Symmetry: C2
Subunit: 278 residues, 2 copies
């Protein structure tokens, strides 16, 4: 049975049993604490079909994360909040320097930040490379883990908890991935994250000689913004269509060598875009 159905079941469970809870803005949600869904990655790619997901943004953003960029321009230049920017100095924000955030923490966790143009080679902990090495040196490992932080949870001095914990697992030549997200916005964030970590998994599997296995998505505060209820009720009536497939078009050897042109989605036949107001 089509895996997208679990996502639609979670939407329905939140509409039915979710409780009113406000977020840091004060804008309301229906909320449920604790959920999990499993999406097979074997011969299919979980890009949701009940609405069009912006695949290109998913790819270009992950690549920008992988590069460790803290330069907003490097991402927008591809064609892809208030409180984070208010922590920045004037000139750094003007030029698009985000400080020590996003993929900086994946590739240079704990490193002294200078500016977005700096050379951080070999500075801090390269969580992504460590994951890939361990898969190679000891696939049975239960600690093949990479964490991500929300930019506003700085500073690292404080030991701020992560936003996401991503665990990889290898058995029978298959790489599986579990993402734990402390909170998930079901209308907008969640579909994008599913595709994003599924793509990461495809990538790591490729360069470690494994086949993709399962993507397991686990949530703490799983929520629907009030203003997304009605568009989601309409999305719930759409029939999922077989997920597409993802193809990597050449043999790639290191995680940093992948390029947007290395990937191609195929057979993606989604229902139309649903605009949901952030």
């Amino acid at each position: 049975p089509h895996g997208e159905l679990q996502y639609l079941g979670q939407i329905q469970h939140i509409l039915r049993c979710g409780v009113r809870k406000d977020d840091r803005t004060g804008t309301g949600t229906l909320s449920v604490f604790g959920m999990q869904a499993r999406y097979s990655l074997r011969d299919e790619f979980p890009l949701l079909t009940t609405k069009r997901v912006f695949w290109k943004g998913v790819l270009e953003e992950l690549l920008w994360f992988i590069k460790g960029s803290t330069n907003a321009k490097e991402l927008s230049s591809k064609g892809v909040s208030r409180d984070f920017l208010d922590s920045l100095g004037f000139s750094t924000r003007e030029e698009g320097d985000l400080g020590p955030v996003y993929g900086f923490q994946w590739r240079h966790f704990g490193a002294e930040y200078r500016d977005m143009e700096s050379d951080y080679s070999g500075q801090g902990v390269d969580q992504l490379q460590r994951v890939i090495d361990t898969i190679k040196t000891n696939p049975d490992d239960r600690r093949i883990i990479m964490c991500a932080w929300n930019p506003r949870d700085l500073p690292l001095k404080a030991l701020p908890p992560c936003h996401a914990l991503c665990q990889f697992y290898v058995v029978n030549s298959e790489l599986s991935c579990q993402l734990y997200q402390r909170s998930g916005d079901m209308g907008l964030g969640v579909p994008f994250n599913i595709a994003s970590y599924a793509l990461l998994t495809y990538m790591i599997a490729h360069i470690t000689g494994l086949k993709p296995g399962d993507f397991i998505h686990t949530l703490g505060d799983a929520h629907i913004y009030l203003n997304h209820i009605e568009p989601l009720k309409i999305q719930l009536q759409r029939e999922p269509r077989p997920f597409p497939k993802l193809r990597i078009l050449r043999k790639v050897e290191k995680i940093d060598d992948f390029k947007a042109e290395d990937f191609q989605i195929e057979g993606y036949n989604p229902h139309p875009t649903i605009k949901m107001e952030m």
Copy 2:
């Protein structure tokens, strides 16, 4: 329907679909990656009934964790591996000094370790106190998180990933808890952890004026040791009995003030002990 049934369903799923995978010893498991179960804490306490769980050990161990003890004697003195001990010097191991591990990381995360008798008041990050303050200052928070590490994952210099991530959640005057464990031994570790974090939840709820809600237990590598298969097959045939209740016997105000004598289990009618060989 009785929540213990989810635990028994997970045992059965692993026996049926689990795959052979070895652990760091090389002793074998059947393994499944990614699972979740929900245990209500409302007017019941999930101490499993299909075998006797050593409640006293669960209590005394959590209290020792809460104290931040790194003194093995402080725990055994109550009546409650090879590789961790081989990292210790001679005299420190002789006297039972475990170094900067277990609840030291809950109450003094990142602090310079000296010895087990040292005064660490106000040193490092008090993750447990921070959780309790945030529940008080902002119950809607999605970052009410506390992490725990396996002792052999030192040193903290390296940014080792956590073993467990524990997230609390508050809605409608109810405190809920989700534990993410990178690996779980279903025969021995898992029942103990369920009770342990359910007890923690009861404790925090008590001193924050809330009612216990749900305990959500999430696993990465969920596994059964080969030598536990047969005793577990027998446990699977036992009918769960209504979970007991937990009673806190006086009004307690700070997390550090709880004592073993403050708690009483009631109505606990378990099937007999099952001895499972570690």
